[PDB]
Amino acid sequence: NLYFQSMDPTQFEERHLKFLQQLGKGNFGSVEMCRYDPLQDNTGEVVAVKKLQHSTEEHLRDFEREIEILKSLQHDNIVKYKGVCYSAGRRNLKLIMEYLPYGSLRDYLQKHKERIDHIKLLQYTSQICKGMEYLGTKRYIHRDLATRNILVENENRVKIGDFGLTKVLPQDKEYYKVKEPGESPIFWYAPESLTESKFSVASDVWSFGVVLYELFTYIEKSKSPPAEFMRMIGNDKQGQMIVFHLIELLKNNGRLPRPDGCPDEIYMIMTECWNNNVNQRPSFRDLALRVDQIRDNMAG
Ligand SMILES: CCS(=O)(=O)N1CCN(c2ccc(Nc3ncc(C(N)=O)c(NC4CC4)n3)cc2)CC1
């Protein structure tokens, strides 16, 4: 009470934060591109600015947690925290982060196939695993790993973003049981997350297997995880029946198919990530090493 938590409300002052562009919607919120131009000279750093879409009390609390999580992370493959802007005369909050010009990896794979080959896909895979290794050291569970939530700086660098669903493991447990769920990205979820609301490093590994699938499908029409799972389940199914059939399919070894042109060895990594036995899934350290060895074992 006596002394409020340390904040730097003069680091990004609203009057100097200039709108450049609307970018998109990250889990609970909206993101814009702005320029921070304190020397009112039409220059300054270009930044991404996340704001809430519905500024309820509960959402503001969740947003504070997301901000504290991101501020605690510093890694080449994690989107950079820059600060907070307390706008509306210090009666609102916005998160200031670095801006990555190529947007989401999901969009980049679709818009920039001219510059993507398997080498690049494996580089992105490696980078994602290394970011995730780093999150694990902090006991953070991302809970929404998907190509839509990975951002592209340039042809040789991607970074994990969207920490809006991230949870911190309890001190004494290796899983977090989410007792509030929102809308869930079910087609990226591990079976124990679907059936028990349990999230862990190992369920992030499951979702990483889906990301690896996404990369090798090159975000092709009809090959997305939702499209393929719905084809397997029955495209006419609606509502909870979808979830019931997804659970049953996964529990009895139904899996996304090997993408066209995907090496068997990469599909094997996917299928090892998609182990119903939580403890048998590889670690992110295992995966980064394996992917880098595959890359390094190529000629040259
Ligand atoms: C060509 C198809 S397009 O015309 O439809 N199109 C594609 C490119 N694009 C775009 C989106 C984001 C970014 N950069 C970015 N940087 C950092 C963050 C961050 N720190 O969260 C972020 N978050 C947002 C992802 C929520 N977004 C750059 C470009 C929107 C318009």
Angle between helices 118-137 and 284-297 (to 10 degrees): 150
Task: State the distance from the centre of ligand 1 to the C-alpha of 139, rounded, in angstroms.
Answer: 28
Q: How many CB atoms lie within 10 A of CB 45?
A: 14
Q: 27 among the known binding-site residues?
A: yes
Structure tokens belonging to residue 97: 């982060």
Strands 198-199 and 30-36 come out as: unpaired
Helix (H) or strand (E) holding 22: strand 17-24
* Cα dihedral sign, 265-112-274-66: positive
Task: Identify the domain boundary among 82, 98, 114.
Answer: 98
Task: Verify that 91 and 121 share a domain, yes or no.
Answer: no
The DSSP bridge partners found for residue 32 are 22, 49
Is the CB of residue 121 below 6 angstroms from any atom belonging to ligand 1? no
29 is in an annotated binding site: yes
Distance CA 261, CA 203 (A): 27
Give dist(CA 124, CA 150) in Å, integer.
10
240 Cα–ligand 1 center, Å: 32
Whether 1 maps to a domain, the answer reads: no
Quote the domain boundaries for residue 19.
14-98
Q: Decide if 28 is inside a domain.
A: yes
Q: Is 144 a catalytic residue?
A: yes
Q: 21: CA distance to ligand 1 center in Å? A: 10
Structure-token pair, residue 183? 């809308």
Instruction: Choose one of 52, 73, 78, 100 to mutate for the ligand 1 pocket test, by most ligand atoms within 8 angstroms of C-beta.
Output: 100
Single-letter residue type at 241: M
Q: Is 85 in the pocket of ligand 1 (CB under 6 A)?
A: no
Residue 137 CA, distance from chain mean position: 17
| CATH at 74 | 3.30.200.20
Cα(226) to centroid(ligand 1), Å: 22
Same structural domain, 213 and 238: yes
- Residue 238's CB is within 10 A of a number of other CB atoms, namely 8
Among 97, 99, 192, 107, which Cα is nearest to 141's? 192
Instruction: Let me know if residue 68 belongs to a domain.
Output: yes
Residue whose CA is closest, atom 27 of ligand 1?
103
Q: How was this model experimentally determined?
A: X-ray
